[PDB]
Swiss-Prot record, chain A:
The gene is SMC1A. Involved in chromosome cohesion during cell cycle and in DNA repair. Central component of cohesin complex. The cohesin complex is required for the cohesion of sister chromatids after DNA replication. The cohesin complex apparently forms a large proteinaceous ring within which sister chromatids can be trapped. At anaphase, the complex is cleaved and dissociates from chromatin, allowing sister chromatids to segregate. The cohesin complex may also play a role in spindle pole assembly during mitosis. GO terms for cellular component: chromosome; chromosome, centromeric region; cohesin complex; condensed nuclear chromosome; cytosol; kinetochore; meiotic cohesin complex; mitotic cohesin complex. This is Structural maintenance of chromosomes protein 1A. Belongs to the SMC family. SMC1 subfamily. CDD domains: ABC_SMC1_euk. It is linked to Cornelia de Lange syndrome 2: A form of Cornelia de Lange syndrome, a clinically heterogeneous developmental disorder associated with malformations affecting multiple systems. Characterized by facial dysmorphisms, abnormal hands and feet, growth delay, cognitive retardation, hirsutism, gastroesophageal dysfunction and cardiac, ophthalmologic and genitourinary anomalies. Residues 103-123 form a coiled coil. It is found in: Nucleus; Chromosome; Chromosome, Centromere, Kinetochore. It comes from the Eukaryota. SUPFAM superfamilies: P-loop containing nucleoside triphosphate hydrolases, Smc hinge domain.
Curated annotation (Swiss-Prot), chain B:
Disulfide bonds: none annotated. It comes from Homo sapiens (Human). May promote apoptosis. This is 64-kDa C-terminal product. It comes from the Eukaryota. Transmembrane segments: none annotated. The chain holds residues 577 to 629 of 631 of the full protein. It is found in: Cytoplasm, Cytosol; Nucleus.
Length: 363, 60
């Protein structure tokens, strides 16, 4: 489905009741330096269940407009997300600050957080994993992971890492039973390795289901980001039989260079290689919408247009893109702009404007 | 008086239209103008703001 609109009431600088959107398949949130854009990112995180400690406050009550300086506009605030899906009624997900704590609602029915999370998960929105979010600095974080840190990441996203301790403990038992081996000792060792092969097979299958998807997609992504047919990208386990035990190697052929580990790249070339891995990882478990918070801050004028055009292309079919963007060479590829501006008041007030770019021709 | 964003963007390309839209946000921040938009994706009308007293024609 689709994130159609966000409705806000008295949340941080968004005083009063405001409609944000409707969103198009590719929408950029832009505006001059101010609390407004990051507050809107926080509203999205908040309606998707983010914890208080991750919303730049110490108390939930301080998310109410004016509460940080002792002048709250109200004793309630809310953020609501309207989720649309072709062939179905709209679904509304809301989080309300009532009496200082969260009230969760689905279609105005009060629910507990467990059910809210479950109903979002059925849509492909994983609020604990935050699969919908590319946080500021995510590109540089991926760029810096060594082969073993890549394997760690694959174990997390594939949930194969949830079987690690059982794997280690079943392997320890198998080693002991094998060390012992009259016939009953043979019988205990056989069952020991069988129970170990079970968890080994299961950890492999969970890892492989994720890794092979990411590994299959990364080449085309790297070609698309590079806008070059000759670029090539390769993921490969150092230990093919048990990939979770060793590193995941990542070699690229940059559009003019030779086959080399991504490590041996630098500058915008390494950034585009890290972007390809980031987007390939998100092509497993992909949320219906993708919120990219200032991803273009990591780009320079040699690849900003390439990444913007990649998101433009992907947004027509594979996912909805919502990008908070500071750079015109990125956000002018969007279908519509949500422009955030400040209003004077006792506290900073943010309001928005909507603008359709599809009405105008390109360069 | 008043200035229509959609009229200013008539005959512009995407980058030009986006920059005029963005200029409305900056000029509102600087209090040179006030902004109204009746409904999502409608025209956006600028009027004189408290911190600029010339003509709106010259501001664009």
């Amino acid at each position: 489905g689709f994130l159609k609109l966000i409705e806000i009431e008295n949340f941080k600088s968004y005083k009063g009741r405001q409609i944000i959107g409707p969103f198009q398949r590719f929408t950029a949130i832009i505006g001059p330096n101010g609390s407004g854009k990051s507050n809107l990112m926080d509203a999205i995180s908040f309606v998707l269940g983010e914890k208080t400690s991750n919303l730049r406050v110490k108390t939930l009550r301080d998310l109410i407009h004016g509460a940080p300086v002792g002048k709250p506009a109200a004793n309630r605030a809310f953020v609501s997300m309207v989720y649309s899906e072709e062939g179905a009624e709209d679904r509304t997900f809301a989080r309300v600050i009532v009496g200082g704590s969260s009230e969760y609602k689905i279609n105005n029915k009060v629910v507990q957080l467990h059910e809210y999370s479950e109903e979002l998960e059925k849509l492909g929105i994983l609020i604990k994993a935050r699969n919908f979010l590319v946080f500021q600095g995510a590109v540089e974080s991926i760029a810096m992971k060594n082969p073993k840190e890549r394997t760690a990441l694959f174990e997390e996203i594939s949930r194969s890492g949830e079987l690690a301790q059982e794997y280690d403990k079943r392997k320890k038992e198998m080693v002991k039973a094998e060390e012992d081996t009259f016939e009953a000792a043979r019988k205990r060792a056989k069952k020991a390795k069988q129970a170990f092969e079970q968890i080994k097979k299961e950890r492999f299958d969970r890892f492989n289901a994720c890794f092979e998807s990411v590994a299959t997609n990364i080449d085309e992504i790297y070609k698309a980001l590079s806008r070059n047919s000759s670029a090539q990208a390769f993921l490969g386990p150092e230990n093919p039989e048990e990939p979770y035990l060793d590193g995941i190697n990542y070699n690229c052929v940059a559009p003019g260079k030779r086959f080399r580990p991504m490590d041996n790249l630098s500058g915008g070339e390494k950034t585009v290689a890290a972007l390809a891995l980031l987007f390939a990882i998100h092509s497993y478990k992909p949320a219906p919408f993708f919120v990219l918070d200032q991803i273009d801050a990591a780009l320079d004028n040699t690849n900003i247009g390439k990444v913007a055009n990649y998101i433009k292309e992907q947004s027509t079919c594979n996912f909805q893109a919502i990008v908070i963007s500071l750079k015109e060479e990125f956000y002018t590829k969007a279908e519509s702009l949500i422009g955030v501006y400040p209003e004077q008041g006792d506290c900073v007030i943010s309001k928005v404007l909507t603008f359709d770019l599809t009405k105008y021709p390109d360069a | 008086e008043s200035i229509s964003l959609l009229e200013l963007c008539r005959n512009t390309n995407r980058k030009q239209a986006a920059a005029k839209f963005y200029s409305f946000l900056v000029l509102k921040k600087q209090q040179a103008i006030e902004l109204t938009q009746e409904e999502p994706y409608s025209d956006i009308i600028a009027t004189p703001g408290p911190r600029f007293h010339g003509s709106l024609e010259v501001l664009f």
